[PDB]
């Protein structure tokens, strides 16, 4: 749009608003899917469907040359403050789930453990580690660690915006033998600004250089960092007439 063309810009914002609403539908749908909640899942998929229809209607009016569709505001109940109720408002949880086929020299008794480093106030702190699984290239750690955050501190918001959690995978050197760094995994925290968990599997790295196997990890909060402004969107749900 030309910067003086206000009706054009309204049209752009209509589409942006609906695209943001679509994103919220899919995210929430995906949270309910991950939690074995079939009914919430279909619910927010159906909400996504209606948002997409309106998105298509607006794009179509623009593809031809018709007036923008009339619209109005409604509300939608997302329950953003209450996904992962198992967690305090102040709590971030890290789950080291499993290693997958580390590229080591041993088959069995490769013995492994994972160190976790989570940045805290005035860089940094919080460090911990998993137990030592024994005798497998594909370990099944299943350990959860909780830490305290301050959503209020703008430098904690810094950390979620820009920074991440470091996972170091170590082989347990035996008698008079030190431990070997098998590989590193670094997971950015910023998806937690609008989502309430990260869950993926990541390649063990050396540099700059993929090592071999993978590590599967979860990072979970009670609600997204930017829950407050997500709620504002849900209070003015843009919906086309009719």
Residue numbers in the entry: 575 to 816
What does the paper say about this structure?
In this work, we have explored the function of coiled-coil- and C2 domain-containing protein B (CC2D1B), a poorly characterized member of the Lgd/CC2D1 family of proteins that also includes the closely related human CC2D1A and its D. melanogaster ortholog Lgd. These proteins are characterized by the presence of four tandem DM14 domains that interact with the CHMP4 family of ESCRT-III proteins (Martinelli et al., 2012, Troost et al., 2012, Usami et al., 2012) and one C-terminal C2 domain that mediates their binding to membrane lipids (Drusenheimer et al., 2015, Gallagher and Knoblich, 2006). Therefore, we reveal CC2D1B as an essential regulatory factor that licenses the formation of ESCRT-III polymers to ensure the orderly reformation of the NE.
We then explored functional determinants shared by the Lgd/CC2D1 family, thereby performing structural studies of the highly conserved C-terminal region of the Drosophila ortholog Lgd. The structure revealed an α-helical N-terminal domain that contains a ∼50 Å long helical hairpin, followed by a long coil structure arranged anti-parallel to the hairpin which connects to the C2 domain at amino acid 664. The C2 fold ends at amino acid 796 and the remaining C-terminal region (residues 797–815) intertwines with the N-terminal helical domain, thereby stabilizing it. The C2 domain of Lgd forms a classical β-sandwich structure with two four-stranded β sheets that classifies as a class II C2 domain with N and C termini oriented at the bottom of the sandwich and opposite to the top loops, similar to the topology of the phospholipase C-δ1 C2 domain (Essen et al., 1996). The Lgd C2 domain is atypical as two short α helices are inserted into the loops connecting β strands 5 with 6 (α3) and β- 7 with 8 (η2). These α helices are conserved in human CC2D1A/B orthologs, suggesting that these regions are functionally important. The convex part of the C2 domain is rigidly connected to the N-terminal α-helical domain via multiple interactions. Interestingly, this cluster is conserved in Lgd (residues R689, K701, K703) as well as in eukaryotic orthologs including human CC2D1B, which is consistent with the ability of CC2D1A and CC2D1B to associate with membrane pellets in cell fractioning experiments (Drusenheimer et al., 2015).
